[PDB]
Write a protein that holds these residues in place. Structure first.
Motif, PDB file in Angstrom:
ATOM      1  N   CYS B  57      22.477  64.042 -31.333  1.00 50.39           N
ATOM      2  CA  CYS B  57      23.761  64.482 -30.735  1.00 50.39           C
ATOM      3  C   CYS B  57      24.817  63.386 -30.886  1.00 50.39           C
ATOM      4  N   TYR B  59      27.707  63.009 -29.503  1.00 48.50           N
ATOM      5  CA  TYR B  59      28.245  62.627 -28.171  1.00 48.50           C
ATOM      6  C   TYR B  59      27.267  61.687 -27.461  1.00 48.50           C
ATOM      7  N   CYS B  60      25.976  62.028 -27.433  1.00 48.67           N
ATOM      8  CA  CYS B  60      24.920  61.180 -26.819  1.00 48.67           C
ATOM      9  C   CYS B  60      24.879  59.824 -27.531  1.00 48.67           C
ATOM     10  N   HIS B  66      30.751  65.061 -23.607  1.00 49.75           N
ATOM     11  CA  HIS B  66      30.438  66.286 -24.391  1.00 49.75           C
ATOM     12  C   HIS B  66      31.654  67.207 -24.324  1.00 49.75           C
ATOM     13  N   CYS B  73      24.983  69.057 -22.407  1.00 51.57           N
ATOM     14  CA  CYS B  73      24.480  68.829 -23.791  1.00 51.57           C
ATOM     15  C   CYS B  73      23.403  69.874 -24.111  1.00 51.57           C
TER      16      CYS B  73
HETATM   17 ZN   LIG Z   1      24.447  65.037 -26.193  1.00 57.09          ZN
END
Ligand SMILES: [Zn+2]
Ligand SMILES: Nc1ncnc2c1ncn2[C@@H]1O[C@H](C[C@@H](N)CC[C@H](N)C(=O)O)[C@@H](O)[C@H]1O
Ligand code: NA
Ligand code: NA
Ligand SMILES: [Zn+2]
Lengths: 297, 122
Positions: B57, B59-60, B66, B73
């Motif tokens: 991911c 964003y992670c 997110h 997520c």
């Molecule tokens: Zn994420």
């Protein structure tokens, strides 16, 4: 021979010896197993640990509670946590922690020294891969280490449900006498070496089914010497063979009973059920955890 | 009104020859799974690789919010199946692709909801 197993458990006869401590000198040192394409060493290592834990009498209640210490990596991700979540039943609560920030698949992640981690709840399984970087860098007489191991000993004695189990990573130099003594507080225990990392003095000290009291008095200094004697005299062939058959990998959801019994109600019948992985003793309250934040200018 | 657009930035970075994000956690599995995009456990088929969701991911991995009100997520805590041909850049694959809300397969990589109706089979 044992090359098709996920690894090798220390034979019971070693636990009854009185060996003198000395250097761990592995014949198969420096070697390395053939890792499957694009698979990280820690994914392979945790996969073999879980493959071995499947052969034990682990309690697996619905709403199982698992905490994973030393889950971070210099990569900023949690390979071991990903394997634990793959292995554990879908309804299991998984919390991980590490000194350094990282991205994880766990339900909750705590960043900071494990000594700052607090929890009002008891756990069903504790996994630790914590290892102090200075253990390699600086050389020292091989005495019992008292950093994160003192926290783990206290966490086992206060936050592990009776019937619960642990898998704590140790090495020739990263070990603790009190942790070996606590292995005697479980129905059974062993030192497990993954076949993919057999060239290392690393092993997982596995405590199976916590009894909350000692069934056997263990001298930790002597038991670590016994562990090193085993590693020095029984060479383990490096092997990744068990990683290629994942058909029976998932931990079977046994639905183990969970009861909130008093310390005075723990009779021999209960100890017998705990010892077979057929009972977990703890309350089933809101799982609440936190990490202390040091405040300063 | 200003808002950082990480998705666009990663795509432009890749188009400029930028090295894809690494250390996505690839899992060991039988490769005899359902082949669905995002699952509770690895479900890779013979033409896919299963990875820990959080590690794939953007964003992670970039430690950024997110892009949705709840900041939820859809990869974290799950396993994402990536076509082997795209396994070199799982973060880029999850960004540039969409999961079919009907069959749960990636659009253009498993979803057959838009194929002509098959003659019925006994
Ligand atoms: Zn994420
Ligand atoms: N006192 C401590 N509290 C918390 N974490 C610690 C402590 N000491 C060492 N560690 C962590 O132990 C970890 C050891 C790593 N080998 C763990 C690898 C990780 N298990 C993986 O899946 O790749 C490091 O990330 C350290 O930050
Ligand atoms: Na699972
Ligand atoms: Na903290
Ligand atoms: Zn579809």
């Amino acid at each position: 021979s044992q090359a098709w197993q996920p690894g090798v458990a220390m034979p019971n006869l070693y636990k009854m010896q009185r060996m003198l401590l000395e250097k761990c000198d592995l014949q198969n040192y420096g070697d390395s197993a053939t890792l499957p394409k694009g698979i990280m060493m820690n994914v392979a290592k945790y996969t073999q640990l879980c493959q071995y834990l499947n052969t034990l009498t682990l309690a697996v209640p619905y709403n199982m509670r698992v905490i994973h210490f030393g889950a971070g990596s210099d990569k900023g991700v949690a390979p071991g946590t990903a394997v634990l979540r793959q292995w554990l039943p879908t309804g299991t609560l998984l919390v991980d922690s590490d000194l350094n920030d990282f991205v994880s698949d766990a339900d909750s992640t705590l960043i900071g020294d494990c000594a700052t981690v607090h929890t009002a709840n008891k756990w069903d399984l504790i996994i630790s891969d914590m290892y102090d970087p200075k253990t390699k860098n600086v050389t020292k007489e091989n005495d019992s280490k008292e950093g994160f191991f003192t926290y783990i000993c206290g966490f086992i004695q206060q936050k592990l449900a009776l019937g619960g189990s642990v898998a704590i990573k140790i090495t020739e130099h990263s070990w603790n006498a009190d942790l070996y003594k606590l292995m005697g507080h479980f129905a059974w225990w062993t030192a497990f070496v993954t076949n993919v990392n057999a060239s290392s003095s690393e092993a997982f000290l596995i405590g199976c089914n916590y009894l909350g009291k000692p069934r056997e008095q263990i001298d930790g200094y002597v038991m670590h010497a016994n562990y090193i004697f085993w590693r020095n005299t029984n060479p383990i062939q490096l092997s990744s063979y068990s990683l290629f058959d994942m058909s029976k990998f998932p931990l079977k959801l046994r639905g183990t009973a969970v009861m909130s019994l008093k310390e005075g109600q723990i009779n021999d019948m209960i100890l017998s059920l705990l010892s077979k992985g057929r009972l977990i003793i703890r309350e089933n309250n809101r799982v609440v955890i936190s990490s202390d934040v040091l405040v300063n200018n | 009104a200003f808002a950082v657009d990480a998705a666009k930035a990663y795509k432009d970075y890749l188009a400029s020859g930028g090295q894809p994000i690494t250390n996505c956690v690839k899992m060991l599995c039988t490769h005899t799974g359902t082949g669905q995009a995002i699952t509770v456990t690895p479900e890779a088929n013979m033409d896919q690789e299963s990875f820990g969701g959080a590690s794939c991911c953007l964003y992670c991995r970039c430690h950024i919010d997110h892009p949705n009100p709840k900041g939820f997520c859809d990869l974290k805590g799950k396993y994402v199946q990536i076509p082997t041909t795209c396994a070199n850049d799982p973060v880029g694959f999850t960004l540039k692709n969409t999961v079919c809300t009907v069959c749960g397969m990636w659009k253009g990589y498993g979803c057959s909801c838009d194929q002509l109706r098959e003659p019925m089979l006994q």
